[model samples]
Target chain A: GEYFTLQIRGRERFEMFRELNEALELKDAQAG
Target chain B: GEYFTLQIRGRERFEMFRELNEALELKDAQAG
Candidate 1:
């Protein structure tokens, strides 16, 4: 498990989460 | 870089973000 330091400001929070989810998906997919 | 005084665990971080997003969306929906 990895750790993250998130600094969210307003609606940008959603964008950050979306990016994180997509990046994790791709990373896990690539690993398998 | 952003800040990381708050260190979040991996999947738990995602879980928290998901909850936060849902809460905000629900709130905005009600206001609409």
Candidate 2:
């Protein structure tokens, strides 16, 4: 598993489940 | 669909679709 630090590119940040697959789950991020 | 390039710890790369809930279906990657 790979860990990630996620920010909404221009918004607040969120954490991940130590893998890319799990990291892309923010509905807001995808919608933006 | 969002495009992704995936590498397992240290292995061959794979690509997949990502639309949050739409992308977790990985009969291929999950099998690995």
Candidate 3:
């Protein structure tokens, strides 16, 4: 929820599941 | 708001501004 924007509600959402691209990634709460 | 799914809020947002790809398109309110 921080330092992130909606990359894809579906596209990004899908990719996020796939761990698609870093550029297309959301700001991860578990990421450093 | 009708048919579109967000492709990128920032990544796709930038592309949407550029009208980059069709797959990344949000379903417009007036699209046929």
Candidate 4:
């Protein structure tokens, strides 16, 4: 198991999730 | 590529991340 915590204000937070979502998309792609 | 954005204040933010981490761990387990 792993854990992560992050703090950011507004726009940076938005960018971070965007990148994370993209990474997860690739993870899913690899799964299929 | 994909994108996601969420807004939450303080403690809910903490709990959300905790749940997300656990869910991701579950995902990893399912993947293996």
- lDDT tens string, model 4, B2-30? 33344333455447654764565476578
For residues A1-32, could you state the per-residue lDDT of candidate 2 as single tens digits? 56665444422232332233453543334566
The candidate 1 chain B region of ten consecutive residues with least summed lDDT is B1-10
In model 2, which regions exceed 4 Å deviation?
A1-16, A19-32, B1-18, B27-29
List model 1 lDDT by residue over A1-32, tens digit each. 88765444355654666676667667768866
Error of 1 at A29 (Å): 24
Q: Which residue pairs in model 2 clash with each other?
A: A2-A18
> What is the Cα-based lDDT of residue B24 in candidate 2?
47
TM-scores of all candidate predictions against the true structure: 0.39, 0.19, 0.21, 0.36
Instruction: Order candidates by lDDT, high to low.
Output: 1, 4, 2, 3
**Candidate 4's residue-wise lDDT over A1-32, tens digit each?**
23334433346545755566456557757967
Off by over 4 Å in 4: A1-9, B1-32
Best by TM-score: 1
Residue B13 displacement in candidate 4 (angstroms): 14
Question: Per-residue lDDT for A1-32 in model 3, tens only?
Answer: 21322333345444442343344455532486
Backbone clashes, each candidate:
0, 1, 5, 0
Q: Considering only N, C-alpha and C atoms within 3 Å, which residue pairs clash in candidate 3?
A: A6-B9, A7-B8, A8-B7, B4-B27, B8-B12
Identify the CAPRI category of the predicted complex in candidate 4.
incorrect
**Tens-digit lDDT track for model 3 on B1-32?**
22223333345444443343334455432485
